[PDB]
Amino acid sequence: RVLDGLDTVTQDSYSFSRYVLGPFQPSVLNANSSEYEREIAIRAAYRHVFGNAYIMEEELAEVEVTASQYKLGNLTAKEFIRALAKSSAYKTRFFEGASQYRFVELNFMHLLGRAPDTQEEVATHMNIYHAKGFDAEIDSYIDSEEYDSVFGDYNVPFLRFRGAYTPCDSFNKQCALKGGWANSDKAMGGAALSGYNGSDGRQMCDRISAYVTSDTTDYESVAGNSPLLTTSPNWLAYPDPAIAPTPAFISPQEVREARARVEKLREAYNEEIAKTQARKNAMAPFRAMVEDMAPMLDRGVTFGDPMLVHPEAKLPENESALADLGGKSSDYKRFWSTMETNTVSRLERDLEEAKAELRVLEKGVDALTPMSTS
Amino acid sequence: MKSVITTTISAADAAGRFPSSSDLESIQGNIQRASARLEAAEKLSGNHEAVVKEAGDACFAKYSYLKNSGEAGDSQEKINKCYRDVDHYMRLINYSLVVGGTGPLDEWGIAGSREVYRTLNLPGSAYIASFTFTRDRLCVPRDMSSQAGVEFVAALDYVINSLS
Amino acid sequence: MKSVITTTISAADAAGRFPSSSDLESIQGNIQRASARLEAAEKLSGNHEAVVKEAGDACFAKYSYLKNSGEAGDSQEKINKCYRDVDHYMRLINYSLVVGGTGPLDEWGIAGSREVYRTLNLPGSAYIASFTFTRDRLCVPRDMSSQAGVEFVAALDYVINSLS
Amino acid sequence: MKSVITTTISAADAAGRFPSSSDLESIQGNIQRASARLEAAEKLSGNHEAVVKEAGDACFAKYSYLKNSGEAGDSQEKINKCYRDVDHYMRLINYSLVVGGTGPLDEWGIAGSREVYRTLNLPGSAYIASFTFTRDRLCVPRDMSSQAGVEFVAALDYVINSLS
Amino acid sequence: MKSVITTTISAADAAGRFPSSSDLESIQGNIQRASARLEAAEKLSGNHEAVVKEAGDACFAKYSYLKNSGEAGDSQEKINKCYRDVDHYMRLINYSLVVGGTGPLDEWGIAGSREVYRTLNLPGSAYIASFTFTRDRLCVPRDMSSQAGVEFVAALDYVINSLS
Amino acid sequence: MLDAFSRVVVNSDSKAAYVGGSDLQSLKTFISDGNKRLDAVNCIVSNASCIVSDAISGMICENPGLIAPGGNCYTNRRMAACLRDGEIILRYVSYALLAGDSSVLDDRCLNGLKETYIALGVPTASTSRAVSIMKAASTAFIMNTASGRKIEIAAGDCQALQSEAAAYFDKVGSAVD
Amino acid sequence: MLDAFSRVVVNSDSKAAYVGGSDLQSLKTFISDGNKRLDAVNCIVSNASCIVSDAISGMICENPGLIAPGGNCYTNRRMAACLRDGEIILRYVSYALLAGDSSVLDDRCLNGLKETYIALGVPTASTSRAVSIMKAASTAFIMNTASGRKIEIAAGDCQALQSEAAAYFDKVGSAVD
Amino acid sequence: DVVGKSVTVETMGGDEVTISCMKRKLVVGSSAVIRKDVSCSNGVIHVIKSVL
Numbered sequence A: 001r002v003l004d005g006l007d008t009v010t011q012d013s014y015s016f017s018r019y020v021l022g023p024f025q026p027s028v029l030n031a032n033s034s035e036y037e038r039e040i041a042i043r044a045a046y047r048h049v050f051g052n053a054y055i056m057e058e059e060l061a062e063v064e065v066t067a068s069q070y071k072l073g074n075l076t077a078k079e080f081i082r083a084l085a086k087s088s089a090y091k092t093r094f095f096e097g098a099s100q101y102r103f104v105e106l107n108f109m110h111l112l113g114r115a116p117d118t119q120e121e122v123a124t125h126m127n128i129y130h131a132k133g134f135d136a137e138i139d140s141y142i143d144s145e146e147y148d149s150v151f152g153d154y155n156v157p158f159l160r161f162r163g164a165y166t167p168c169d170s171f172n173k174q175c176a177l178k179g180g181w182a183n184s185d186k187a188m189g190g191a192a193l194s195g196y197n198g199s200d201g202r203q204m205c206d207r208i209s210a211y212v213t214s215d216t217t218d219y220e221s222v223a224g225n226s227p228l229l230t231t232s233p234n235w236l237a238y239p240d241p242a243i244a245p246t247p248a249f250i251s252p253q254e255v256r257e258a259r260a261r262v263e264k265l266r267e268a269y270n271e272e273i274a275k276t277q278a279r280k281n282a283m284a285p286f287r288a289m290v291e292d293m294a295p296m297l298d299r300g301v302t303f304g305d306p307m308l309v310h311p312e313a314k315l316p317e318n319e320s321a322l323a324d325l326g327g328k329s330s331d332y333k334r335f336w337s338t339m340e341t342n343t344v345s346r347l348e349r350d351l352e353e354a355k356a357e358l359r360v361l362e363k364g365v366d367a368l369t370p371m372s373t374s
Numbered sequence B, C, D, E: 001m002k003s004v005i006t007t008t009i010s011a012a013d014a015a016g017r018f019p020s021s022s023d024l025e026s027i028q029g030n031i032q033r034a035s036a037r038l039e040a041a042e043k044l045s046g047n048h049e050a051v052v053k054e055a056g057d058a059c060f061a062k063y064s065y066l067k068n069s070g071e072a073g074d075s076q077e078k079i080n081k082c083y084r085d086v087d088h089y090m091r092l093i094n095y096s097l098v099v100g101g102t103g104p105l106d107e108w109g110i111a112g113s114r115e116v117y118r119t120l121n122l123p124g125s126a127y128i129a130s131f132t133f134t135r136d137r138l139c140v141p142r143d144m145s146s147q148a149g150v151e152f153v154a155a156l157d158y159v160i161n162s163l164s
Numbered sequence F, G: 001m002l003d004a005f006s007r008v009v010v011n012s013d014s015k016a017a018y019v020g021g022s023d024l025q026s027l028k029t030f031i032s033d034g035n036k037r038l039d040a041v042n043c044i045v046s047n048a049s050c051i052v053s054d055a056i057s058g059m060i061c062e063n064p065g066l067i068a069p070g071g072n073c074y075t076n077r078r079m080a081a082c083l084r085d086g087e088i089i090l091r092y093v094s095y096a097l098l099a100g101d102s103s104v105l106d107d108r109c110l111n112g113l114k115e116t117y118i119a120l121g122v123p124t125a126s127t128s129r130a131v132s133i134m135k136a137a138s139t140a141f142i143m144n145t146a147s148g149r150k151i152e153i154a155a156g157d158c159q160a161l162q163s164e165a166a167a168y169f170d171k172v173g174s175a176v177d
Numbered sequence H: 001d002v003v004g005k006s007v008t009v010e011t012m013g014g015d016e017v018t019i020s021c022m023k024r025k026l027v028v029g030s031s032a033v034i035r036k037d038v039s040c041s042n043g044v045i046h047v048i049k050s051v052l
């Protein structure tokens, strides 16, 4: 077994996921710290808990008492987040103007760091709402055993890149619900636009259909504005994970050509794989011939120096465990040049480039009526 | 990749400030130590192939049982993979040696190495045999300069202490 | 205090690692630029009192209305506090100059200065008048060689950009 | 310890309910399979010492290099620790065999084994050599019943799939 | 729906592991107890209609005041709903009896029952009168052999303890 | 999450009546074929690790450009996430073998996979190749016809169950494509 | 985040070979031009708040409909977030001047910005105008040709570096539009 | 030629322009390329959203 368990049980999941590359790591006020350390951890908290939302110095006075208590070290960090989420600030950004799906979904993000798994869970937390208010919702999220086990009392919440992911669609959610480093929650939801003068804006929800019914968020929404993208690890995948931008001046001819190309590439692909099984060890009959005539060809070592040995006689020093077959620098260096040389490998990359292009077309062909044809 | 530049930029980004004179002194130190390390990288890209030969040949000089049974070195092809992975690590020592932090050597080689090597029955002791052979074949006077040699020792130290 | 050492130690501590050669290279940069700044700090502690004189005298040379009414310079005593605060700031330029980051000048002078100055009806433009006068006064060859002067200007820049 | 009882009690406790008929059927199944496994545990505590002998002797029968150099089996004393750790694993197979879930064998043997074995340069392949030798050794129709032998196979399978 | 299978699969899913031998023993017990419960379900689908008749007739045999005023049993139509809801409960007893956990009887009948019954002025004591009548009319050695009867007792117990 | 029991129960509630005869008869066959199901899952769970390594290594050996630079098996980290993915897929297939219904596999793991591999740049053709190899390997272990492992069990016909496991793997491979 | 060092390393890993000579030669030019880069970043660290204030004040004065009611610079709070966003753009441009590669600017700040300003209703041409004013002001401070500020430095040609900084501002401007 | 790397070329005028391609985006100076390449027997036409 490669891995023990989920995000909570063990942390092998964090070690070989995207988590290591990201600035999505926990932050701690370590003992007695100066203003530089206090101010760092307090802002990293404000960035996560408000989701890059924008706190003026007037709105900081709302949160100020609690901020001071955390600067002590009297309050644990989870009780600090509790006092952050109970603030009238955090009510005004999120509880005041939101639909319930959107809202509950938010406190999963800011409190737990994860996107909601199923509709049943979402409904459970809504039933906790109608039971005992906003306050006992917040209390229910912070006092959860999964929360305590993952974060502890110290660590500010972060986006957990636990490679387990109960539902893949919940991953696609979790990258969609946080839209990258530039974005914020007011941008993702049109609270600002809807509201007059940058305020009193109702929060819009999307993906409700994906909570209710078995759906999937778009490759666009997960590919354009993402922690996957901000924590980019500079990958030479011939696969581009980035979406190609939508080209202008698209015509239907350009798209029938690409569809036909994709289908031709799929056919050639299946044929080449099926052959690939056929290859076996073509070299193997000759290999077996050489294995047969081994007593003539194989030769024992002469123990000597460079001087005083008959020519073409192997010394025990030049029993290199790569000179024993007769390989070379090439032979260890071969699989790195294999993308161009291999037929099958060459085809797979072409397929994928063709598929990315096909989608980018499927966007662009959608535009109708008023298009300047080219 | 963890380097001087990325640590100070990332730290100033987490700070929420312009890069003050402290980061400027950090990159000043990078451009001070740069020449010594880059001499190391030039010489490594000089004779890397002989480093593959002596490295892997010492690696099977110690452990011969790998060539004995089906386990990890059954064919000549798996021996090609043996020397191949050694050249990956030397190439990552070249990379981190050029960058100057342990960043690419960490995120490309070390990250998730333990699931792979545990999964595919790969012993780490043979790798460590190879690298300890390379650090035993290092002369301060000769080959690369003493300052270059020091940085090469440090990077290869980090390789072993990552694996062991 | 934000310095080279504190940023790279804190960075590696948050990492959970031993300090690799990147922090070491970063640290080397501190001990490279050290001499230029320390020359600056020595000269600052040399004639600081005349720096108080020129600084404050230009500060009231610009804004005369402070001496006019009850507001901020009603008495001679408040003027003594005016020059006193200026000497506080110069002493913090000496401290950050010795540390080499803007650490102590940030945590002792700038942090929370905004609620104080806003509360007590203190105009910041008068401080910036003083500091701008000090930056302008310097002649590099004659007093602070070259780079010592550069480091001094950097620090005092940061004082103004903190206040403004 | 993960067992039937602990999973259903813990699951019902997380539920916030009294134990309904489902948990009762689960422990009904535990008391159905119980006799077969316990026969296995009695026979394991019968001849465990000969399991130590054949297990470790096959473990060095495969890999001889451990006795060769300083690496992991330099002295007779480390070989005593070799047989000793094997007896720890057999004792945990006895314990999990009694409990019937993989609980004590997980929390005592497997948990954090990878950092320890990777730290102290202990190869897993020699353990796996030992255990694979033991799977072959049991004779189902003469030494154990199908149910008892089967459960022994399952537990020792879990040991290898934990380690490899 | 809570059953043996769903609890052990869901628990192993939350665990992040393959299903080990403990879950396998749990489902072993489910396939042990299966026949006894299913005998109960077959006989329930046998004579459910007379269970409707004796159940509801005993339900108004205890409480006569429901037929007296406008409150809950004003018309014959509300009495048709009274019998109707009893047949809903018996159908859920059949369902949870087949599944073997209290899953479908919980999520279909019990979940949110208290807001409805409290809202629409429905007393629970008349339901409990009906179900206590059905458990008083348990013909064990002649109708539901032994353990089929036992499982039926357990399910109907859970119904009353859910409502009360 | 639904077993075969809850599938019969949900169908009977769509029919809006009691349980009856024939549904229970098919469920009786499920109970009596329970031992085969248990031993199948046990066999699959055992040596599960060997199957995953073999499948992904065969994916790389069929198609060498995965290990080539800028393939999704290039970096050591990428090999790690790759092995983990193989392991999780085999894990949920084993859950679907115990449940008898693919509710678990569909709701937990299968749903929203396409967005995940498209959005990461993972090549789909290769992924379905690895699912195919885990399918053949898993059916050979489930039939005790593996070369490297032939353990004694009481013999009997279990083709039903093999077609069931092949159904789940074909569900995954058809889902990623 | 990648500097010039990691850019050479990533390109050499696409080539899947050792760094060698020529790439290191271009990086030696980076090292020898390093002190000019240090003094240039010093020229942008110090005058930034003033540049930000001036650039956004010039943006409002060139386009007076921002201060008009129902504009995005109307409310006092909106002017505050406006000034702060100009400051942050200049901040990441300064990071791109230290790194020598635009990977910090692309990954941290640029990606996710167009869709944000569209989702808020922020006029994009006004933002690109403000980026253009910060570009010209930053090149004038970086070439010591500012009117109100002429600080002494030892003389030398630095046109390469000016084209570099203009490339980053151009990049930020391009992203918004 | 530009995918991955970033190249700086002098124009027909005396001024200079940086051309770069990051994450399948090709931009010349301030404004991004909207249509990729159009062969015209003496070089290429690239199509752009806005006037440089």
Ligand SMILES: *[C@@H](C)C1=C(C)C(=O)N[C@H]1Cc1[nH]c(/C=C2\N=C(C[C@H]3NC(=O)C(CC)=C3C)C(C)=C2CCC(=O)O)c(CCC(=O)O)c1C
Pocket (backbone or CB within 6 Å): F050, F051, F054, F057, F058, F061, F062, F132, F133, F136, F137, F138, F140, F141, F145, F146, F147, F148, F149
């Ligand atoms: C894991 C260690 C295994 C044990 C133990 C065992 O007995 N065999 C392993 C699992 C196993 N593998 C298959 C099927 C295939 N395995 C393939 C991969 C290899 N084939 C290659 O050419 C290469 C590269 C040289 C590798 C790594 C392939 C391909 C198949 C056949 C695929 C198909 O479409 O059928 C099996 C089933 C066959 C069997 O052994 O009975 C098993 C159990």
Ligand SMILES: *[C@@H](C)[C@H]1/C(=C/C2=NC(=C\c3[nH]c(C[C@H]4NC(=O)C(C=C)=C4C)c(C)c3CCC(=O)O)/C(CCC(=O)O)=C2C)NC(=O)[C@@H]1C
Pocket (backbone or CB within 6 Å): B043, B044, B046, B047, B048, B050, B051, B137, B138, B139, B140, B142, B143, B144
């Ligand atoms: C010094 C403490 C030794 C010793 C040194 C000698 N080294 C010889 C050859 C040799 N050395 C290396 C390692 C070196 N080359 C590299 O490229 C790098 C790092 C990038 C290192 C650390 C190699 C690969 C070789 C073979 C190629 C060559 O000849 O240069 C050497 C010559 C040995 C001989 O020909 O007999 C010597 C003498 N000298 C000593 O006395 C101590 C033990």
Ligand SMILES: *[C@@H](C)[C@H]1/C(=C/C2=NC(=C\c3[nH]c(C[C@H]4NC(=O)C(C=C)=C4C)c(C)c3CCC(=O)O)/C(CCC(=O)O)=C2C)NC(=O)[C@@H]1C
Pocket (backbone or CB within 6 Å): D043, D044, D045, D046, D047, D048, D050, D051, D054, D137, D138, D139, D140, D141, D142, D143
């Ligand atoms: C049956 C399917 C085999 C086989 C069985 C034989 N086993 C022999 C020896 C032996 N077996 C074990 C394992 C057993 N002892 C235990 O204590 C436990 C569990 C607690 C088990 C499962 C051991 C340790 C030994 C060595 C000690 C002994 O001799 O009893 C054996 C004798 C081999 C010989 O002397 O040549 C046999 C024959 N017989 C077969 O045909 C199949 C393969």
Ligand SMILES: *[C@H](C)[C@H]1/C(=C/C2=NC(=C\c3[nH]c(C[C@H]4NC(=O)C(C=C)=C4C)c(C)c3CCC(=O)O)/C(CCC(=O)O)=C2C)NC(=O)[C@@H]1C
Pocket (backbone or CB within 6 Å): C059, C066, C072, C073, C078, C079, C081, C082, C083, C085, C086, C088, C089, C108, C109, C116, C120, C122, C123, C126, C127
């Ligand atoms: C001089 C150019 C001014 C002005 C100065 C005044 N400052 C007054 C109070 C005050 N000043 C500071 C800053 C100072 N204290 C420190 O600890 C440090 C650095 C470590 C500095 C730079 C503080 C914190 C305070 C409040 C505490 C105190 O009263 O000392 C002050 C008194 C104001 C009042 O009470 O109305 C004055 C007058 N005088 C002027 O005319 C110009 C503008």
Ligand SMILES: *[C@H](C)[C@H]1/C(=C/C2=NC(=C\c3[nH]c(C[C@H]4NC(=O)C(C=C)=C4C)c(C)c3CCC(=O)O)/C(CCC(=O)O)=C2C)NC(=O)[C@@H]1C
Pocket (backbone or CB within 6 Å): C043, C044, C045, C046, C047, C048, C050, C051, C054, C137, C138, C139, C140, C142, C143, C144
């Ligand atoms: C050079 C670029 C100038 C300029 C320089 C002059 N400075 C004069 C006087 C003066 N300068 C300072 C600042 C200096 N003294 C210190 O103690 C420190 C740092 C610790 C610095 C940076 C002070 C305090 C004074 C007053 C005391 C004194 O006379 O030394 C000066 C004399 C002016 C006069 O008497 O008219 C000059 C000429 N010369 C120039 O042409 C450029 C603008």
Ligand SMILES: C=CC1=C(C)[C@@H](Cc2[nH]c(/C=C3N=C(/C=C4\NC(=O)[C@H](C)[C@H]4CC)C(C)=C\3CCC(=O)O)c(CCC(=O)O)c2C)NC1=O
Pocket (backbone or CB within 6 Å): A017, A018, A162, A163, A164, A165, A166, A167, A168, A171, A235, F066, F071, F072, F073, F077, F078, F079, F081, F082, F083, F085, F086, F088, F089, F108, F109, F116, F120, F122, F123, F126, F127, F130
């Ligand atoms: C609960 C179910 C569940 C899954 C099924 C996985 C699915 C999954 N895989 C990845 C992520 C990944 N998955 C793979 C796997 C692949 N490597 C290749 O060469 C092949 C194409 C393919 C194996 C067949 C790789 C390489 C990554 C990392 C991709 C990258 O970072 O570039 C991610 C993103 C998070 C991460 O990096 O781990 C997710 C959600 N995760 C889950 O939680």
Ligand SMILES: C=CC1=C(C)[C@@H](Cc2[nH]c(/C=C3N=C(/C=C4\NC(=O)[C@H](C)[C@H]4CC)C(C)=C\3CCC(=O)O)c(CCC(=O)O)c2C)NC1=O
Pocket (backbone or CB within 6 Å): B059, B066, B071, B072, B073, B074, B078, B079, B081, B082, B083, B085, B086, B088, B089, B108, B109, B116, B120, B122, B123, B126, B127, F057, F060, F067, F074, F075, F076, F079
């Ligand atoms: C970026 C860095 C980087 C590495 C360091 C390697 C590490 C590595 N090696 C292998 C894989 C392998 N590595 C070896 C090597 C060994 N043969 C032996 O006899 C010795 C014990 C050892 C050489 C000293 C072998 C034989 C395999 C194939 C194992 C197998 O399929 O059984 C694999 C799995 C993928 C594959 O099959 O290629 C990986 C990730 N790959 C990387 O991407």
Ligand SMILES: C=CC1=C(C)[C@@H](Cc2[nH]c(/C=C3N=C(/C=C4\NC(=O)[C@H](C)[C@H]4CC)C(C)=C\3CCC(=O)O)c(CCC(=O)O)c2C)NC1=O
Pocket (backbone or CB within 6 Å): D059, D066, D072, D073, D078, D079, D081, D082, D083, D085, D086, D088, D089, D108, D109, D116, D120, D122, D123, D126, D127
């Ligand atoms: C509760 C369960 C439990 C275990 C399973 C063991 C596991 C274990 N073994 C060792 C330690 C050891 N284990 C071995 C064993 C080996 N010698 C070899 O030649 C083989 C590779 C291998 C036997 C198959 C050796 C030699 C040491 C000492 C290693 C050393 O000091 O170099 C240690 C460190 C402490 C010590 O020195 O004893 C531990 C925790 N201990 C436990 O508490």
Ligand SMILES: C=CC1=C(C)[C@@H](Cc2[nH]c(/C=C3N=C(/C=C4\NC(=O)[C@H](C)[C@H]4CC)C(C)=C\3CCC(=O)O)c(CCC(=O)O)c2C)NC1=O
Pocket (backbone or CB within 6 Å): E042, E043, E044, E045, E046, E047, E048, E050, E051, E054, E137, E138, E139, E140, E141, E142, E143, E144
């Ligand atoms: C599917 C499950 C199922 C059951 C468990 C039974 C339960 C049951 N028993 C009776 C009915 C009855 N049950 C009994 C049994 C009893 N005689 C006594 O002396 C004892 C107290 C007790 C046996 C232990 C008697 C005597 C009647 C008839 C009562 C009467 O008519 O007075 C009735 C009413 C219909 C009838 O008259 O048959 C029902 C529904 N029926 C079902 O369909």
Ligand SMILES: C=CC1=C(C)[C@@H](Cc2[nH]c(/C=C3N=C(/C=C4\NC(=O)[C@H](C)[C@H]4CC)C(C)=C\3CCC(=O)O)c(CCC(=O)O)c2C)NC1=O
Pocket (backbone or CB within 6 Å): D033, D146, D147, E024, E025, E028, F032, F033, F035, F036, F037, F038, F039, F040, F042, F142, F143, F144, F153, F154, F155, F156, F157, F158, F161
């Ligand atoms: C608690 C754990 C647990 C298990 C792991 C199983 C183990 C198990 N399997 C069978 C019994 C069996 N197991 C199999 C299984 C198969 N035979 C084949 O040739 C195929 C390779 C394989 C397909 C799955 C068969 C065919 C039988 C005998 C037929 C039968 O009993 O239905 C029996 C009957 C008793 C006996 O044989 O002694 C038991 C207990 N049951 C359990 O309670």
Ligand SMILES: C=CC1=C(C)[C@@H](Cc2[nH]c(/C=C3N=C(/C=C4\NC(=O)[C@H](C)[C@H]4CC)C(C)=C\3CCC(=O)O)c(CCC(=O)O)c2C)NC1=O
Pocket (backbone or CB within 6 Å): B021, B024, B025, B028, C033, C147, C150, G035, G036, G038, G039, G040, G042, G043, G141, G142, G143, G144, G153, G154, G155, G156, G157, G158
């Ligand atoms: C830690 C912070 C830190 C800095 C901020 C710099 C500051 C600095 N610059 C130079 C040195 C230099 N700086 C410049 C820069 C300039 N070229 C011009 O056309 C413009 C006026 C100006 C860029 C805006 C030049 C040209 C030199 C070399 C001067 C010369 O040798 O003539 C020197 C002397 C050492 C050297 O030659 O590199 C120093 C200390 N160095 C540091 O360690």
Ligand SMILES: C=CC1=C(C)[C@@H](Cc2[nH]c(/C=C3N=C(/C=C4\NC(=O)[C@H](C)[C@H]4CC)C(C)=C\3CCC(=O)O)c(CCC(=O)O)c2C)NC1=O
Pocket (backbone or CB within 6 Å): A052, A053, A054, A181, A182, A183, A184, A186, A187, A192, A197, A198, G066, G071, G072, G073, G074, G077, G078, G079, G081, G082, G083, G085, G086, G088, G089, G108, G109, G113, G116, G120, G122, G123, G126, G127, G130
């Ligand atoms: C890391 C990079 C990074 C950025 C580049 C910014 C981008 C950004 N700006 C705003 C938000 C804002 N940005 C502006 C700025 C504008 N005012 C105008 O008159 C002009 C059109 C424009 C300046 C040129 C305003 C006014 C708001 C607040 C909008 C509102 O609430 O109505 C928000 C939403 C959160 C908030 O309110 O602060 C974000 C993410 N934030 C980041 O984290």
Ligand SMILES: CCC1=C(C)[C@@H](CC2=N/C(=C\c3[nH]c(C[C@@H]4NC(=O)C(C)=C4CC)c(C)c3CCC(=O)O)C(CCC(=O)O)=C2C)NC1=O
Pocket (backbone or CB within 6 Å): G068, G069, G070
């Ligand atoms: C309560 C919901 C509500 C509104 C919102 C306004 C919107 C509005 N503005 C008008 C028209 C209008 N609006 C402006 C622009 C505006 N005025 C200025 O002097 C400046 C600086 C402006 C931008 C800040 C002008 C210049 C006119 C023309 C009338 C005039 O001379 O002011 C008209 C007249 C339309 C017509 O003539 O048919 C309307 C209805 N009216 C409403 O009932």
Ligand SMILES: CCC1=C(C)[C@@H](CC2=N/C(=C\c3[nH]c(C[C@@H]4NC(=O)C(C)=C4CC)c(C)c3CCC(=O)O)C(CCC(=O)O)=C2C)NC1=O
Pocket (backbone or CB within 6 Å): G050, G051, G054, G055, G057, G058, G061, G062, G132, G133, G136, G137, G140, G141, G145, G146, G147, G148, G149
């Ligand atoms: C009435 C509304 C209004 C403004 C506000 C300004 C804003 C402004 N500053 C410019 C450009 C500009 N601004 C400064 C910075 C500035 N100058 C200094 O010497 C010091 C110390 C500064 C900060 C205090 C510099 C250095 C330049 C470059 C031109 C120059 O050499 O001065 C430019 C030219 C832009 C371009 O070249 O495309 C404009 C439009 N203009 C307006 O019409």
